[PDB]
Fold this protein.
Amino acid sequence: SKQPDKQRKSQRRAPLHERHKQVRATLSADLREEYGQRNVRVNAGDTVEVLRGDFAGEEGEVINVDLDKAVIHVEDVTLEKTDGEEVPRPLDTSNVRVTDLDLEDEKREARLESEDDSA
Amino acid sequence: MQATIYDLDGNTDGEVDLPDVFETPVRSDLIGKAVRAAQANRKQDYGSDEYAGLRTPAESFGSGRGQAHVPKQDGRARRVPQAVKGRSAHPPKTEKDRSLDLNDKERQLAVRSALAATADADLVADRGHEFDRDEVPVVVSDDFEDLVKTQEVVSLLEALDVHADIDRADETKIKAGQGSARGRKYRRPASILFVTSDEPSTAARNLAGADVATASEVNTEDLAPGGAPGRLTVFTESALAEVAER
Amino acid sequence: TSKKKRQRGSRTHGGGSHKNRRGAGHRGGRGDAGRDKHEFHNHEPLGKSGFKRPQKVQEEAATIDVREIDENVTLLAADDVAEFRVDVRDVVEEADDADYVKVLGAGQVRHELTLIADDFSEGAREKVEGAGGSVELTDLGEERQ
Amino acid sequence: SKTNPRLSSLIADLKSAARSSGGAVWGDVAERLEKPRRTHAEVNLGRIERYAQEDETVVVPGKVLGSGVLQKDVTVAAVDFSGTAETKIDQVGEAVSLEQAIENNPEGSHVRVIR
RNA sequence: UAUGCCAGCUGGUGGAUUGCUCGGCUCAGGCGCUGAUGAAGGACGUGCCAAGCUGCGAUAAGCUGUGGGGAGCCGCACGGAGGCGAAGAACCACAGAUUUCCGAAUGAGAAUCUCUAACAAUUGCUUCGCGCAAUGAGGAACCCCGAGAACUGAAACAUCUCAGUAUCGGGAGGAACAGAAAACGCAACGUGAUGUCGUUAGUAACCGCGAGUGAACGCGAUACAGCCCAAACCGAAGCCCUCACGGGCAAUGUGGUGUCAGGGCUACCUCUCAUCAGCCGACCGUCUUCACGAAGUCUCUUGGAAUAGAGCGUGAUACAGGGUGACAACCCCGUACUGAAGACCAGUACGCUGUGCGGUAGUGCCAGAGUAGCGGGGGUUGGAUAUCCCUCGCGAAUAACGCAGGCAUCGACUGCGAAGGCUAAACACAACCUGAGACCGAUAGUGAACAAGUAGUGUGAACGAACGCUGCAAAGUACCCUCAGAAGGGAGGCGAAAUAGAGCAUGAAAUCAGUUGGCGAUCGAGCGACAGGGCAUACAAGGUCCCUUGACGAAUGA
RNA sequence: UGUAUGGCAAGUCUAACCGGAGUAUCCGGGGAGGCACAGGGAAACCGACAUGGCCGCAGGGCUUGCCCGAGGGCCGCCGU
Ligand SMILES: [Cl-]
Ligand SMILES: [Cl-]
Ligand SMILES: [Cl-]
Ligand SMILES: [Mg+2]
Ligand SMILES: [Mg+2]
Ligand SMILES: [Mg+2]
Ligand SMILES: [Mg+2]
Ligand SMILES: [Mg+2]
Ligand SMILES: [Mg+2]
Ligand SMILES: [Mg+2]
Ligand SMILES: [Mg+2]
Ligand SMILES: [Mg+2]
Ligand SMILES: [Mg+2]
Ligand SMILES: [Mg+2]
Ligand SMILES: [Mg+2]
Ligand SMILES: [Mg+2]
Ligand code: NA
Ligand code: NA
Ligand code: NA
Ligand code: NA
Ligand code: NA
Ligand code: NA
Ligand code: NA
Ligand code: NA
Ligand code: NA
Ligand code: NA
Ligand code: NA
Ligand code: NA
Ligand code: NA
Ligand code: NA
Ligand code: NA
Ligand code: NA
Ligand code: NA
Ligand code: NA
Ligand code: NA
Ligand code: NA
Ligand code: NA
Ligand SMILES: [Sr+2]
Ligand SMILES: [Sr+2]
Ligand SMILES: [Sr+2]
Ligand SMILES: [Sr+2]
Ligand SMILES: [Sr+2]
Ligand SMILES: [Sr+2]
Ligand SMILES: [Sr+2]
Ligand SMILES: [Sr+2]
Ligand SMILES: [Sr+2]
Ligand SMILES: [Sr+2]
Ligand SMILES: [Sr+2]
Ligand SMILES: [Sr+2]
Ligand SMILES: [Sr+2]
Ligand SMILES: [Sr+2]
Ligand SMILES: [Sr+2]
């Protein structure tokens, strides 16, 4: 709807299968041309480059993708705890760009390559 | 008077008689009244729950306990308008008629007057529209209705030295107040009105501040948004002719 | 600014003493209370008067004055122009939902008119004939006897 | 206060004429037009035919209506005429706006107020 | 200078204010029954850890299939441990399995348990056996049939009013009810089932003729649709159960004919496309869900962060809305366009099968009784003599008759066939789905943005609150000192900010601690207004002021 | 029932509702019906000054007191 309350509500209360679209990131120029898509559902295998936070400019492998909080963990994009331990600093996929893909899955690869359905 | 017709390239292509209605004396008061009505007539009825604050058997103790005769329940004041959690004394009411009537003749007169304000370049500029042109309204060939791409209309507007207005409307304002919480965060300047004859221009509609309309049903609000006369308009040769007998 | 808008701060909002605006006592009873007692003034006096005949036995005539007919002679060019001949039945509005058409004699007749209607007033005949005109009673008009 | 922009101009023009030219009627008509609408003149042709005379402009500080018959060849000037009034008047004479009258006769001579 | 007064400053307390919205409120569109095949509701269980909510049912936050979906997952819920998923999990749609006890609650009984085969109870059919079936109870309101106040108004009050309202009993449905004239009575050479909407109209009518109450015909619309018995004349030519055999029903009449364009019968003309029964069975449209889906994440500056400013550039049948570390068409979801599915329209329209319309002549063969109608007594209604109904009593005709047309009787005229029955559509409501908003914005708006009908109150019926906000990211404070100490304190670390460190954005007033200025232990009380002195004063946002003299010089005036 | 403003004017307004569309807005249509255009009378029933006289404000005219004088005022007269 056009109402802000319903818009935010449908986004926060979206079922698991609908949360995949909340972890989508734009593709690099090459990848866009190769698959005929502007963006993709970030996977825990893809390589990504940070374009917005304090980590803008850094690249790394996506180590985790949490659908519940619709956020991602990327290698070396971390914060140092008080005890010295190093923990990940979650990222919103919209502040990120996919530079390499993990196509170990036949289904994902087939999904990306087809013209009718995106991925 | 005579209006100059323009082709899809922006070059002069003959001219036609500007219909008599455009000579109708500009009447901002009548136009404003007509707009006030259209705006009111779309407002939805509202009102608080008729039983709000009344769902309590609260009673007053009366005299004897050194307290005000205010209805209480479980030691809490209830129901009365001065009591927190009590009823609303004179709240909005659903039964209220929020519509405004307007005589057909009086409204039609305003439509004609708004049409005429469109023919005065000084007025159109006074309203706020940005454009480098002497003639107004802008008249174009019926082939305009065949355009498909928004950008092909941009080319035409630039060629007609009327695109400056779209730049003016290409600035959204984030309103002050709680309208934001109800879906009314943005607002923007009103730009060009495109009046065609068969179907509203799909190609011109997404233009910043643009409004599309058809000659048989274009209204006072199309011609004078917010009640302000003199909107920068662009008719279609056929539209310009049909708008004559309104 | 309106009167209402100026009331905040007045306490009484123009009611005088704050003891005034209470219940129906301030009105002398609800509605038409006291119409024969404390508030009898300017009130139609009590009582019955006359009678009414049944609505389906009542006749409703459609009337028109010679003045209206005469002032629009040239305009009524869609009606016969003899040595003007006019059937009033085609002139009067509401003639459909009326039992008959009657021509009354208010005003002047500055032309020679040949009027056809279901009835005419004495003055209507005097005036029409007086300006060299004639009055023609319809078949339905053939009741007076 | 008046709401019609054109009525306001008319009154301002009537005043300007009365002050600048030798007019007194225009200023008279202006004061009356400044009064509430219900007091404004609503005159039918019958009254014009009865009190008007040729070569003396009829001035109506209001609006002229179509009831009655006008035979005299008179120039009638008013704030507004009904569609029928203007038609009947133009047949035997001439209907003119109070604005034209101020232009042709700013001195306001040989004219009769009718209401 | 103590006790202390006034104002302020630093820190509290408090939670106003401003900003924010997971909730409300209201409108609109769609849709609409459930239950003995045991519903709705409740109880008690059910998780590795499990109190609450949500889910589920001993197969217990779940099992199976199909399609979708996808590299993650294990609800709200951001822990730990462990586990599941490419044998395609999660999640979603559709379908199915499981589904304790109480509950209409139905074997008997019982405060959710117990006792010894159960449709308890009332009915229909009946193989007379619970063998086959029905009922019961629920549902936001709407709807239909019954029972039916008072406060109040009349400035008292009784008729009247509030009002057939509140409330009670019974009952159906997705809508109900009504409905094919013993009509209307713009009286007509006229209308033509019924609702409903607009109007007729506050009109006619009622009424301590007071206060008040209050239609209809018609008209303009919406939607439109007309039929079935009883009887005549036929007389078993019939119906129900069963696969069949067979059984049951039915001469107290199954079945044919027939139903006011009356019918039947006898004698004819002609024709059917009416009707009724049944088969087939949508388009379009509407509501919803879903697929697809354009174009920048470029430079510089500032910043913790660029969606900012400046510069350059792009799409647009897409410049609705939302999200993203600040104002985003072009970063993400979406949005336009096009397409797909389900639901409703509707088992309707159309088409089809069977049936057969209709007209003449004759025939007093048939056509609904405690009725029509009248009287007594009530109620009700605008119904007045002329509303509708109840009750007591009386009581007809037979179409060659009868009823109606707003008093009665008789005649005339016009209309119409009661005392049998069915009937789609157009209209009410809002539970449920979706959408919308010049509505409210946490003492508001729901009682409820939170544990909400929660906590809590009452024997019970019933009553009933309050509680929103760390941060960009938990980076949710390591190590050390102190201490009885996982307390607290100190130091320290993180962050733009801890005066963001847990009811953790902002942080008013009342008010409290400390402190600054002024006053203060010989002096008097609406706390001040206006004049004038003391003391006090960082900047900014005000820059004037004092004295000599001179010029001007009103009233007044030496 | 007043009042101010605005449209139209011997008329004026549409109601329900219908079509369109940019789909609660809006454009077109819809005059059923209401009020106004005649009154008086319980009713039956009958049915009026588009001006006949005199004052005279505003305004106009003139040769500057004298004319024409809407509205207004006092009468006639007309309908019942
Ligand atoms: Cl009568
Ligand atoms: Cl007049
Ligand atoms: Cl009729
Ligand atoms: Mg692809
Ligand atoms: Mg409240
Ligand atoms: Mg504000
Ligand atoms: Mg039992
Ligand atoms: Mg009383
Ligand atoms: Mg009564
Ligand atoms: Mg009903
Ligand atoms: Mg009394
Ligand atoms: Mg009543
Ligand atoms: Mg009737
Ligand atoms: Mg039969
Ligand atoms: Mg609250
Ligand atoms: Mg705080
Ligand atoms: Na309550
Ligand atoms: Na007190
Ligand atoms: Na309303
Ligand atoms: Na008072
Ligand atoms: Na003390
Ligand atoms: Na539904
Ligand atoms: Na739990
Ligand atoms: Na189940
Ligand atoms: Na049973
Ligand atoms: Na049995
Ligand atoms: Na009283
Ligand atoms: Na009393
Ligand atoms: Na009474
Ligand atoms: Na009629
Ligand atoms: Na982003
Ligand atoms: Na009744
Ligand atoms: Na009786
Ligand atoms: Na009748
Ligand atoms: Na609160
Ligand atoms: Na001082
Ligand atoms: Na009419
Ligand atoms: Sr979750
Ligand atoms: Sr969660
Ligand atoms: Sr006492
Ligand atoms: Sr007063
Ligand atoms: Sr009271
Ligand atoms: Sr008296
Ligand atoms: Sr009519
Ligand atoms: Sr019909
Ligand atoms: Sr019968
Ligand atoms: Sr009679
Ligand atoms: Sr509070
Ligand atoms: Sr510290
Ligand atoms: Sr002096
Ligand atoms: Sr109209
Ligand atoms: Sr007079």
